[PDB]
Symmetry: none
């Protein structure tokens, strides 16, 4: 009774809040710049922060500056001093967000990108113009202009690439994560601190952290808070009237109602935070691989080009031409737009994540997530629709003799704890019985005998006010009932019957609990049992299937018995229908008379009934085999394992702490959701690969094509048509992105260790490239011309290049899928349009010199295809092993079986540890 | 007595019904189209189904629409409402069949075939004409016409290939499988639901499923049915008078007589079925291999051809000629007719299956069946002509003291159960004795002590009305009689004698049973024993031999003792005459004091006396060694193993459930039948291979032959003669099919894993091809001509091609057999006719330019042979191992022997578990 009523009152807020990606659009289109009437040197800004936090109080001629007193002095007595009252004006929120945002300061830095590549290229184009204007009397008519023209195009791209990511961040404001309950609807609601604009009513309780500077309104008796983080002395502060909740810690003392006054840089624990962040160095893995490649491209290009220059005096051209050939080759080569391209994908990709009841923060975590190999997920609420709620309690006939009801009511324990509707069933159940009351919600409990391995069961010695004595027991069915006595003697029937039912229940699920009652635990008095099961669902059942197809290993952690656990595992699809005892479905039991379960635990999934300080070792041990992991928080006992791991997945309706030591959040408290996530991540990588291959492969051909002519051929490379290819080939194309549907059909990629653009990929580019590169020389380099002066060679040398690259860019679609054309709609649209430029470029202007347009053009198409087919093969891959490797496998047979049998043997002893012991 | 009389009455229908493949011919020649006065959009049709099933009742102006009330509401009370009466008019059956057919909706889909190949080719021919008519002023006289002409021919083939399969399905109506008993003959008869046309009297009993909407006539007291499948609530329905049997489940409550009213799409559980089937994706293995190859041909051809085009500017021909060379090469290459060819074989092949008292459904199961490696078949009724009927019961002298007759009568158990004539023998036997009565059929049995391993025997405590007490025992001879006491003391003689006889019986078969009688089982009183044996037969004894020659492993599951089992095994041929104890013949005994038999079971065949929940593991374990399987249903306990397996073979006179979790049925309840099946399956594959080799091999030569000329030679390729070869070579030929007699001499093929057109086969085509390809260049490319203008080169270049390909197509006969000409009669007929075209094509028209006709023609014959010989060698294959591989084998000797001995040792203990125990 009086327990819950108090639980119900203080909670409930069904819809996080269906509040669109709008407010962001409006806000972001005025962010970074504009108002803020103070534009001092950045230097003074930092100093101001370190001078504000604490320090005495000078006049600023502005409303504000009360947050400083928070981390400079107690602020106990004076807090009521400062005084309270304040709300926003919708306006303040838009600005505060832009400067404070996510009440923790994050550093955004460039590992160089912007400078070493950024405007290092920009200068080249500038000196190009310089050279252009330097040549007074030069016989080159408008070359200076052309280069200037091209350089402009390159830039256009420059700015474009850099612009979208900025606006993207503005649109991230106003989301819904955790830490901050406010009053909006008809009930208190939860919302993000950043969104938690000043004004909305927040509610701080025990153990919670202040999402923002809040002016206390009232509540519980005493309100204690730890201001250490800000000031000093770990001594809790007694906030008196119209108090103030900066961001300190609520030392589980009292509860408070409040209004958010400060919510940004102007924040209390947002002032001692958001305005003081000296620097440091630290990079991500893949970023390392990327940087590494950038270099291997940096030198590779800048060298091959140099060659195309000095090895051309043989071609009979002044080193000058060769010079502007190497430099020219440099420009094309320079795979630019990488920072912008992966930042856009990161930002956008993270939006969709956020868009699907799965809130993910820090784009630096996507990398890892994409490489997830194992997913350890809790059952109730995540995997199963049924919280850990046993609806099938069951007790035999009756007796009604006093303590009879006591035992039945108390020892209806369970697994988890926290309440549900499961207990209510018990409440009403009692009612069914006599008519009395409470029994359910109640009792005076002081001592708890920790569940010891031998007897296999927990118990608690409780004493009613005026009563005899009672001790309620819970634990495994078998062992518990082995004791049992109960009012009337333990008849055979009663026994047999009890078992059978539990068995019946647990062979298709059901999570059996054994309840008796004695005083110490020795005594025997079986009351009943309360099993459970749970309809999996929509995307979990399929998501699991996807997991296997993706290689990803999913482990379930539940508070159900191994028997049932295996049943659930089998039900979902984890473990098919095959009853194990080896690991799959069955697994192990972090049990005492099952200890040896640490071998069963690591049964590659199923884990049922485990303890603390072992999480630690389990992660260590699992990692020792290079098993990555996506875990789900819980208690302090799992903290070490959490930190050890790499990915932390916290439930939206869970704890924030966990969401910190992690890299994402579950709103859609569904399991199927994660498999989807893994899917996207995998999509992100392939696409990146396909994107790189196209760029590099296609670009490499131009590298030596330039070289070729450098030595032979005849025609030339010149601003005009060259600049064209450059614009249509090195721009958007290398850009493009799309999700690959099959991609969930590829094992997880190794990060840290695994080398960037894979060797095979390197092969893919060289292959496709080497074709078109050569296919250029013989495109017409055989063909047939009548006068020798390039009036056919050029018209195609350019038309072909433009067309091929087109081709390559379509061998860049999904890196996982093999053999797909006309995809990427936007990409295709570009192809046609791009092709159009080419046609016009050849039609009128050159309408009188076309010869290659009749049977040279067709040849393009006939070969504009081989590129697609080449990829189709690459994409489909099959490994070959020399018939001796598989043979060894022929041997693995037995010892494998033997091992299994052995495991089973002992695993057999563990089914009845006590009997065995007794027998011995 | 009163037991059987009631069994006899309710059964018997000797001939499934000798009803020909006629009615099908007539029906199918009007199916899909015609009447049905409503041709709405397919959209409305689906919606109509989901709107019918349940939903309120609008007017349609037609007789019908009563089936909807079945799955929309109880329909208990109202069922008598709707009312009953209705029969067909022969007409209705023909139509209902066409729309309903096999009261389960099957999806027929094309994985592309029809479109990506179908009319993708059709367009090419159309644009060919377009190009033809586009060239106004072209100097090519009638080329447009020629191509149009050819394209027509290609089509003719197009339609032809697609037409036969459609009509084939019409001819499948009217067959005899299971589920549906009707009154036609002088007794109730069984027939297929689809054939079960409205009108015929059906009889539904307990546990049966309603084959069709039936208007109940009457029968048993209460008739309960579960309408869940349709409506809701698992609560059985009490069908009152003139009831209705839609398709619900008969909850083993009552028996009913009825008349089938609705039998099609208009069906009750045919309405909630046959009109609602949203889609999905799922393909077969080999289909995967096929599709895979299609691609490898798709690209291969479309590429080599492209080459034959652009590498021909060297030949001195405008890219145009080379263009229509690549495209031309494309057409020939494109191994078309694959969908039609394998669909025809599938359909037809499945007809013959159905034609031979072996009913097989779903052409997607043939693939697997063909690859059957192991066949686990039950003895009685399948392998042996003798049902499990022991005719040699035998008891000693007499006593006549009361309970003496009791024991003898009751404990005459057996193995199986269900009745036979075996029991009748016992009935009459008793008669022989005094003259009394029943004893046989009777007794009051309530309790059954499950046969426990120690004592090795089952027993049942029965109590007559007014009598002392009695407990009948059955089980292994040895152990049972070890107890025995009986009226008069257990004399030595009596004992010794008893044994000897059983031994005598069981060393040439005989399935001994031990019968006593006590109360608990301790007591001893031997009554007698009832062995058995069984004449194998015609095709079983030979079929078994075929199995071995085919590699297929056959396992027998019987209810006879190991001793006898091995005898039967030896008798049949499974296990020769060599008494084992290792596995072959003897095998194992799913016995208690034989437990270790799980190693003997997997003795590679023989299994005698096994239990439930082990089927599960046995299949799992067997599969763990890549052992495929064709199994035979039975009980619920074998269900898991059945689902695990891949092929289910159910007896025609058996259960339907099994026939579901399977892929075929045994009408001819013979074992020999399966071996025949395996034979056909194997025939189907080879033929396919031979068919592919011919097509591909022969086609590849034309691929580069085109290329050759592209570079050199002189003559040309042109519509006329080219179109001819195309018509006679790419049509029927690639088509043809035949059964290979030896083919039962080849081990089973690996499906899923094994690669399609085998590498060796790839070699076979390339070999044969490479010959004729080259043999063309030197056919006359050496020969001797006087003027240089092709008047000899052409006349033969075409005549040869036509002749060779002829040759190749005969290297396509049975892929298993090696060295066979003039086979395939139809094929040969074609050869001659085809050859004729060639002769005329050369004779008159070209009568004045022939030079090659004298000694060029003979040369054809001399080499028109080497192709046959080449195959003959390929077909005969011998493996070579380096003399060290066999040596290891020299070592296997011992350890093999040692292992056997060891097995035997323990296997020796198992012959007398109890003695041993006692001694210990």
């Amino acid at each position: 009774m009086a327990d819950h009523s108090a639980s119900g009152a203080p909670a409930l807020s069904t819809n996080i809040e269906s509040g669109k990606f709008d407010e962001k659009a409006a806000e972001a289109a005025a962010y970074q710049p504009k108002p803020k009437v103070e534009d001092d040197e950045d230097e003074d800004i930092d100093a101001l922060i370190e001078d504000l936090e604490s320090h005495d109080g000078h006049d600023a001629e502005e409303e504000e500056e009360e947050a400083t007193p928070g981390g400079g002095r107690v602020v106990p007595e004076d807090m009521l001093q400062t005084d309270t009252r304040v709300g926003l004006t919708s306006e303040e929120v838009v600005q505060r967000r832009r400067k404070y945002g996510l009440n923790q300061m994050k550093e955004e830095k460039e590992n160089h990108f912007l400078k070493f590549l950024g405007f290092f290229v920009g200068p080249i184009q500038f000196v190009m113009e310089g050279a252009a204007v330097l040549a007074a009397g030069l016989e080159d008519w408008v070359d200076f202009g052309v280069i200037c023209g091209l350089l402009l195009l390159n830039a256009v791209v420059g700015f474009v690439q850099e612009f979208q990511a900025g606006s993207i961040v503005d649109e991230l404001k106003k989301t819904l994560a955790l830490k901050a309950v406010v009053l909006r609807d008809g009930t208190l609601k939860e919302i993000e601190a950043p969104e938690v604009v000043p004004g909305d009513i927040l509610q701080v309780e025990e153990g919670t952290i202040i999402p923002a500077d809040g002016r206390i309104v009232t509540d519980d008796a005493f309100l204690q808070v730890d201001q250490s983080a800000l000031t000093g002395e770990s001594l809790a502060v007694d906030k008196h009237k119209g108090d103030q909740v900066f961001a300190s810690s609520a030392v589980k003392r009292g509860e408070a109602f409040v209004v958010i006054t400060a919510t940004g840089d102007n924040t209390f624990v947002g002032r001692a935070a958001a305005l003081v962040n000296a620097a440091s160095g630290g990079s991500g893995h893949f970023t390392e691989v990327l940087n590494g490649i950038g270099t291997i491209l940096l030198i590779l290009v800048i060298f091959t080009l140099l060659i195309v220059w000095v090895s051309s005096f043989y071609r009979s051209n002044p080193i000058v031409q060769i010079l502007e050939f190497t430099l020219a080759i440099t420009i094309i080569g320079v795979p630019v737009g990488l920072p912008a391209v992966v930042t856009t994908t990161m930002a956008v990709g993270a939006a969709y994540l956020a868009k699907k009841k799965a809130i993910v923060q820090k784009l630096s975590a996507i990398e890892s997530l994409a490489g997830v190999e194992i997913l350890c997920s809790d059952k109730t609420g995540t995997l199963t629709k049924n919280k850990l709620s046993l609806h099938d309690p069951y007790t035999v006939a009756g007796v009604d003799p006093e303590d009879l009801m006591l035992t039945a009511c108390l020892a209806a324990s369970r697994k988890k704890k926290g309440i549900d509707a499961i207990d209510k069933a018990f409440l009403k159940s009692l009612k069914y019985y006599p008519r009395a009351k409470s029994v359910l919600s109640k009792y005076k409990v002081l001592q708890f005998h920790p569940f010891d391995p031998v007897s296999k069961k927990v118990v608690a010695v409780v004493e009613s006010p005026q009563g005899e004595r009672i001790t309620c027991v819970k634990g495994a069915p078998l062992f518990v009932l082995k004791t049992v006595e109960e009012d009337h003697p333990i008849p055979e029937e009663v026994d047999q019957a009890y078992k059978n039912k539990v068995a019946e229940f647990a062979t298709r699920g059901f999570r059996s609990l054994g309840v008796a009652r004695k005083r110490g635990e020795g005594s025997w008095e079986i009351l009943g049992i309360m099993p459970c099961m749970d309809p999996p669902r929509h995307d979990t059942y399929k998501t699991v299937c996807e997991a296997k197809t993706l290689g990803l290993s999913i482990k379930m952690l539940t508070g159900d018995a191994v028997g049932i656990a295996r049943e659930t595992s089998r039900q979902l699809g984890l473990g098919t229908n095959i009853y194990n005892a080896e690991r799959l479905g069955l697994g192990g039991g972090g049990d005492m008379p099952g200890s040896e379960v640490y071998d069963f635990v690591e049964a590659a999934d199923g884990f049922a009934e485990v303890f603390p300080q072992h999480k630690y070792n389990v992660v260590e041990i699992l990692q020792q085999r290079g098993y990555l992991v996506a875990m789900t928080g819980d208690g302090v006992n799992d903290a070490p394992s959490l930190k050890k791991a790499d990915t932390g997945i916290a439930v939206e309706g869970s704890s924030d702490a966990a969401r910190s030591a992690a890299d994402i959040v579950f709103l859609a408290p569904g399991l199927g959701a994660i498999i989807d996530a893994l899917k996207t991540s995998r999509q992100i990588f392939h696409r990146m690969y396909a994107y790189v291959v196209y760029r590099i492969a296609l670009s490499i051909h131009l590298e030596i094509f330039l070289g070729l002519w450098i030595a032979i051929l005849n025609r030339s490379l010149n601003i005009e048509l060259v600049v064209f290819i450059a614009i249509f080939a090195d721009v958007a194309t290398l850009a493009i992105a799309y999700d690959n549907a099959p991609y969930s059909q590829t094992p997880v990629k190794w990060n840290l260790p695994k080398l960037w653009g894979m060797s095979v990929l390197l092969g893919v580019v060289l292959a496709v490239g080497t074709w078109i590169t050569v296919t250029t020389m013989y495109a017409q380099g055989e063909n047939g011309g009548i006068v020798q002066n390039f009036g056919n060679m050029d018209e195609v040398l350019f038309l072909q290049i433009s067309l091929t690259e087109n081709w390559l860019i379509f061998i860049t679609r999904a890196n996982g899928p093999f053999w797909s054309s006309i995809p990427s709609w936007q990409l295709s649209g570009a192809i046609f349009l791009v092709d159009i430029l080419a046609t016009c470029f050849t039609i009128w202007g050159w309408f009188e010199h076309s010869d290659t347009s009749i049977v040279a053009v067709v040849r393009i198409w006939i070969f504009s295809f081989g590129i697609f087919c080449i990829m189709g093969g690459v994409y489909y891959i099959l490994q070959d092993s020399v018939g001796f490797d598989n043979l060894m496998h022929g041997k693995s047979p037995k010892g494998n079986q033997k091992q299994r049998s052995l495991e089973d043997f002992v695993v057999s002893l563990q089914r009845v540890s006590t009997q065995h012991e007794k027998s011995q």
